[PDB]
Structure formats: structure tokens, C-alpha cells
Amino acid sequence: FLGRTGSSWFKIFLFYLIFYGCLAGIFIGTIQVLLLTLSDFEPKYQDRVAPPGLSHAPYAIKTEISFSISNPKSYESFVKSMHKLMDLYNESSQAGNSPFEDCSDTPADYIKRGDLDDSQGQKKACRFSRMWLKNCGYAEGKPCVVAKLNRIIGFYPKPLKNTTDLPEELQANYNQYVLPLRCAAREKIGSIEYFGLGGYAGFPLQYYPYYGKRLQKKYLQPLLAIQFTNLTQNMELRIECKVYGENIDYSEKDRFRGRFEVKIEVKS
């Protein structure tokens, strides 16, 4: 033929069949032992998610949400993702004492449901009403963005203490139980309005620590609705929403490390 005879062509096939078969069987074996060394409830390493990311619902083309108020299908793209998220926080999804629980309607302290063990059933998560998100189809004019803190197993978000000076200096400082979120731009051509649990501009600490998908399915993380009823129009406004805390940090590279990058433009 090309290389060899039929007899040789066969033997080279019988070899590579057994050979690659063995190699596949060995590869699988090493994957088995790897998995055997891992927990079902907690990942081996967590230093790469460490400082929590802050992500929002409006799917930004490039950290930007520009549209026209005087146009219907101009914002119907951002309403798709906005709906996708809030559709999960339905009351019909949170039914019965299992696996949900009614928690303080005001920001409270942490809740420990034991260890990362299966020695108990599904760890009961705090309910969250999308109805706590006042004012927010969504904002056809002047968007109503929804913030979110990235989930990390066993992470206890710790707010800053009012020992020294603060950006939003001491205003509504629920020091003991709220992780604040203050959006900014100089360039003050807007109108910041925050909505959340208990009416505070933060995340209620009663939703922590997260026990993971395996130990807490259907779990709901707290949301923070933000509305920009800015009196300006037809210009790119670089708005940055920042979260503050002891376990919260940022990076010049990762522009989502505990903060937002939104470029709103109501070009109408």
C-alpha cells in the first residue's frame, strides 16, 4: 500500500489499539486518585477568588450600557439579563420551611449552620424578596442597575469600623451588620439612589457564610438595586460602584475586584 503489507498494517493497528487503550486507562486512573483527594463540600484552594468580585445584571457590551429612551428595542437587550436574574428571586421559588427560612427584615449578624459537613440536610438559607428592591419592564429612562457580591464558601464579609474617617462619612453607618456600596464618578452629574434589604445601601450579613452548592442549593445571595435618575443626557458617564470592608480589596488589572465599571449613556 503506502507503507506496509496488510499483515503489517494489522499489527500496527492491534498495537496502537492496546497501547492507547492502556494510556487512556492510566490517564483515567490518575484522574480517579485526584478526585479521591478532594472534598465534595469545599475546594482545596480559595486564594484565587479571595477578594470577592462585584458583578451586575445589565450585560455590558464593554463595561457599558448605552441606549435611547425614545426607543423601545434600544434597552430590551439589558432588560433580558435584568429579568434573568430577578426571575430567580421569585416568591413561588421560596416556598415552605424547606429549604428556606424567614430571616430578620433588618440587617443582622452572621448565621453558622455548623460545619461544611453532610451531618445535616440542606443547610437552610435566608429568604430574599425582590420586593425589597423598590422602584425595580425596568427603567426605560435612567436605568435601575442591580449589584451582587460573588459567592465564596465560608467567606464572612466584614464591614469597616467607624474608628476613623470614611467616604460616606458616618451616614446611616450600620457598622455592625452592613457591607456598604457607594457609587461615584468632580464629574458629579447624576443622582444616586440605593435600594436593598432593610432599606440600607449594603448586603445583610445574615446571608453568610455561604455553604456551597452541594450543602446549600436554591440558596439566595443578597442583591442591591441602584438607580441613576441623573438629570443629564447624551454623554458617557463613567460610574464606579465600590464596596467597602475588611476582606474587600481591589486591583488595577481586575476592574471587577469588589467594584463596578459602568458607562451609562441615555442618548435620547
Partner: protein
């Protein structure tokens, strides 16, 4: 610890780099020694 389990989300990449560079250097020296056993 409980609420004070910050160490769980931390890794000393600084020491690791110091050690890694020490090792790389020493392996580089060892190599020179064996090569220079005759030039």
C-alpha cells in the same frame, strides 16, 4: 476559625517566589559545577 477564618482565602505567594528563585539559582549553580568538570 469561625468568622475570623481569613487565612482560608490567603496564600503566601511572596515566600513561594523567594523559595522558587532560590531553588532556580542553586540548580543553575549545580549545573555549572557539573559542566565545568572539564569544560
Amino acid at each position: 476559625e469561625g468568622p475570623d477564618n481569613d487565612e482560608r482565602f490567603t496564600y503566601d505567594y511572596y515566600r513561594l517566589r523567594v523559595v522558587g528563585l532560590i531553588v532556580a539559582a542553586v540548580l543553575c549553580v549545580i549545573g555549572i559545577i557539573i559542566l565545568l568538570a572539564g569544560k
